[PDB]
Amino acid sequence: AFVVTDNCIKCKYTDCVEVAPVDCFYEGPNFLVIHPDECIDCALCEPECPAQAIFSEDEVPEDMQEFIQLNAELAEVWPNITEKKDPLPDAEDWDGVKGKLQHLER
Numbered sequence: 001a002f003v004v005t006d007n008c009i010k011c012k013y014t015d016c017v018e019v020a021p022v023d024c025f026y027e028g029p030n031f032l033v034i035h036p037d038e039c040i041d042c043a044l045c046e047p048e049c050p051a052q053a054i055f056s057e058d059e060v061p062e063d064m065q066e067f068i069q070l071n072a073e074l075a076e077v078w079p080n081i082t083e084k085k086d087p088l089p090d091a092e093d094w095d096g097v098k099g100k101l102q103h104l105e106r
């Protein structure tokens, strides 16, 4: 499984979903997650993300380990996203800001 980490929050560029072969992505208000069971580990999404938020499970940063579990339980409750959409409004202002999980919206 691949995993969406902190930088996606409040950016949500949704470029990653345009390459997904299966329905691996689940949309939140200001964040996306990857269903670990859907994910075929194709790895196409990871280069697409402008926020560089996506990592292979095996490679999630130490400080971002909570996101492995977070994507797994949030994907059981959010709707599937299959189509790209515009980024959120302050997306470039929020790109690269750290600590954004404090801003996560369910």
Ligand code: SF4
Residues within 6 Å of the ligand: 001, 002, 019, 020, 021, 022, 024, 025, 034, 038, 039, 040, 041, 042, 043, 044, 045, 046
């Ligand atoms: S690695 Fe492929 S299957 Fe997994 S989330 Fe990315 S696009 Fe989807």
Ligand code: F3S
Residues within 6 Å of the ligand: 004, 007, 008, 009, 011, 012, 013, 014, 015, 016, 017, 031, 032, 048, 049, 050, 051, 052, 053, 054
């Ligand atoms: S910012 Fe988030 S919506 Fe996709 S393109 Fe990156 S993981």
